[PDB]
Amino acid sequence: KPRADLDRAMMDPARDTVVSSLYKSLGGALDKTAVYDEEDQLLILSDMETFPETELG
């Protein structure tokens, strides 16, 4: 299993190798994924608008 305390902030990109770059490309050291989407992605909009009634009508 890949090591702990690995992140793409302390690891110098200038010292990258084949395996290290392949690990970065395959989503390794993803400790920055604490962000969530924060979008409902099932929210159907319900902002109905009422048309004003005219005198003709």
């Binding site: 395959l26 989503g27 969530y36 989407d37 979008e39 992605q41 929210l43 159907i44 909009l45």
Partner: protein, 504 residues
């Protein structure tokens, strides 16, 4: 209220009842498998595997049971024609009863998951709403499917722990379940090589296991999460339907064109074996090889097996049936009793004549006899037309070699016309008509019915995939559009279409 076509959307955000309805569907499918197997066992006749095999009797799930090992029955018979003293539990009846019991267990599980829908597992620890972590669920399921595929291909197909799969020869004479060693070269991509099945399942199981590890380990990118709407389960439905109808097209093609996974001793011959004269060429080659050994025509044609001559017949062509000619193939031309032998047609001068075979396109074909050059020397008039090359005029005589009528020569015109009509269809056979009251119109094999059903199902699931992709990518405007559309639809109002920040 909900319309009738949206009644199942109540389990869209209810994971427990989604699992419950999936369990109910699985129970229904397993119960159909069991009941279909029981019915087919009730209507199957295992007495003559040569001239009345399972594809002549309309067996649909029996070929799939016999494809990967299950060939014996508790009645003491096998589909290969042999006798089994000790059948074991995994016979056709054992598989059917196992499917029935599995259906019952899945039904009870569906009941439990419908009643106990509010499990704490289905609720997000961060928000508390009922949610499913679909990427990690996909990782788990991909890992499970990789393990299952690798196990199937490494133990079941190879015979390391399992029966193997059905392997036949090039002409469907001697087929049985054998262990299959995988082929890791380019010959594993030969679709008629059964070693490709084992090698494919091993390699794909390994790759799926690795990909499942990756998908459990790694979260999706934010761009792909927003683009594919991975928080919505309808994108999973859309992509699954897409993959399912892709697979249905693949199986439709491999069933119609034939492969090692669709042997002709279980699903019957293909139409391209009749179009190319496959069995006819093989039979002619064998007869020529026997004639080169000093034998006469009777001994050469008597050496041809009845199975091989039965394959060279247009009533076994899957492209000769009808959409509403329901039932087994024996409900059509009848139940085959014996091979009458190869007819050779000779005129008054002794020149041999061959009746031109009926193509698969033609419901009716005119009976014409050609010589070795290809010139019409005799024929049958349409129904009552005045004739020039009729059978009565040329004096065509037919002599049969091999089969039941071996050595007999028929010289009377009605019999010669009857046998020319029969030889138009390929090899002349004897059919039984009073057992099932066969009407006399050709019917399709399980190969053709499978191809029809699955081609139509794939075509309809293409529409289903389009519908669910549309409902996924357009979830926000499901009930209609608002007043924010009028500014976007003005031509040239924005530089980029649909982007409010690119206003001119």
């Amino acid at each position: 209220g909900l319309p009738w076509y949206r009644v199942h959307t109540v389990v869209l955000n209810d994971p427990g009842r989604l699992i419950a309805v999936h369990l109910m569907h699985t129970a229904l499918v397993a119960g159909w498998a069991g009941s279909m197997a029981l019915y087919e066992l009730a209507v199957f006749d295992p007495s003559d595997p040569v001239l009345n095999p399972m594809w002549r009797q309309g067996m649909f799930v029996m070929p799939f049971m016999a494809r990967i090992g299950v060939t014996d029955s508790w009645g003491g018979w096998s589909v290969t024609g042999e006798s089994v003293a000790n059948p074991g539990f995994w016979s056709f009846e054992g598989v059917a009863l196992a499917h029935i019991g599995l259906s019952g267990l899945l039904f009870l599980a569906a009941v439990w998951h419908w009643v106990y829908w509010d499990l704490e597992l289905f609720r997000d620890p961060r928000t508390g709403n009922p949610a499913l972590d679909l990427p990690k669920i996909f990782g788990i399921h991909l890992l499970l499917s990789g393990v299952l595929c690798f196990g199937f291909g490494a133990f079941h197909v190879t015979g390391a722990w399992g029966p193997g799969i059905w392997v036949s020869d090039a002409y469907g004479i001697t087929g049985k379940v054998q262990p299959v060693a995988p082929a890791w070269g380019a010959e594993g991509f030969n679709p008629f090589n059964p070693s490709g099945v084992a090698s494919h399942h091993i390699a794909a199981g390994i790759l799926g296991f690795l990909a499942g590890i990756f998908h459990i380990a790694v979260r999706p990118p934010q761009r792909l999460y927003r683009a594919l709407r991975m928080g919505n389960i309808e994108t999973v439905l859309s992509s699954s339907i897409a993959a399912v109808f892709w697979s249905a097209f693949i199986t439709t093609g491999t069933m119609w064109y034939g492969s090692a996974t669709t042997p002709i001793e279980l699903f019957g011959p293909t139409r391209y074996q009749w179009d190319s004269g496959y069995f006819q060429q093989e039979i002619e080659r064998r007869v020529e090889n026997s004639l080169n050994e000093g034998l006469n025509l009777s001994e050469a044609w008597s050496r041809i097996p009845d199975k091989l001559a039965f394959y060279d017949y247009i009533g076994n062509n899957p492209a000769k049936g009808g959409l509403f000619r329901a039932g087994p193939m024996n409900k059509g031309d009848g139940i085959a009793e014996a091979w009458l032998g190869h007819p050779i047609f000779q005129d008054k001068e002794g020149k041999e004549l061959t009746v031109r075979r009926m193509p698969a396109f033609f419901e009716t074909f005119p009976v014409i006899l050609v010589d070795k050059d290809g010139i019409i020397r005799a024929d049958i008039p349409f129904r009552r037309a005045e004739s020039k090359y009729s059978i009565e005029q040329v004096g065509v005589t037919v002599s049969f070699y091999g089969g039941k009528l071996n050595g007999q020569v028929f010289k009377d015109a009605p019999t010669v016309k009857k046998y020319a009509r029969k030889a138009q269809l390929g090899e002349v056979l004897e059919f039984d008509r009073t057992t099932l009251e066969s009407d006399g119109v050709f019917r399709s094999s399980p190969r053709g019915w499978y191809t029809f059903g699955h081609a139509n199902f794939a075509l309809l699931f293409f529409l289903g995939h389009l519908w669910h992709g549309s409902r996924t990518l357009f979830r926000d405007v499901f009930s209609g559009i608002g007043a924010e559309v009028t500014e976007q639809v003005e031509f040239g109002a924005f530089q980029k279409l649909g982007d409010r920040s690119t206003k001119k």
